[PDB]
Design a protein around this nucleic acid. Sequence first.
DNA 1: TGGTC
Length: 177
Amino acid sequence: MDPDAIKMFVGQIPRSWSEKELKELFEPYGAVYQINVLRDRSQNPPQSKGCCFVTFYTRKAALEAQNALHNIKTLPGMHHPIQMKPADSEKSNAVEDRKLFIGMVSKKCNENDIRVMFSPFGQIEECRILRGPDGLSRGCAFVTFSTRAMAQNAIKAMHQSQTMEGCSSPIVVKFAD
DNA sequence: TGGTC
Ligand SMILES: [Mg+2]
């Protein structure tokens, strides 16, 4: 398979189908490397959970199949069309693993001051000062970078690097809970 | 109030 191939998750497959029927469904869109039905072994006999993974050899074939099938094609006996999307095992750079909690921020700071402070470390895609139900700043912020490496460099360079106005302790910079 | 969506 190509180094950029995508394993795809496919839902709304008839439980009666196996890899044999799925091979006939998918191969017209491109060469298929692997098909695996997700199975339930909780009792005897085991059964299909009604979904599968398909890995095309090429990324282009995976994307064309997804474009052609997802919410388009209804398989026999089904009441809803195929759902098709990249498999969760393909996720690599999750937002939660590149989001920082910034603590001990001056209650005066706004999202723009934080961006100015953390911009040197990479592309910021989200920045929020945290506010309670009264609307008052809670003295902390969330900063999401585009990659985890950016977030880690910000931690090493900024954690306890200074104490802001009105704060009892130096700024805290850590991966968010 | 050292406060994590
Ligand atoms: Mg408090």
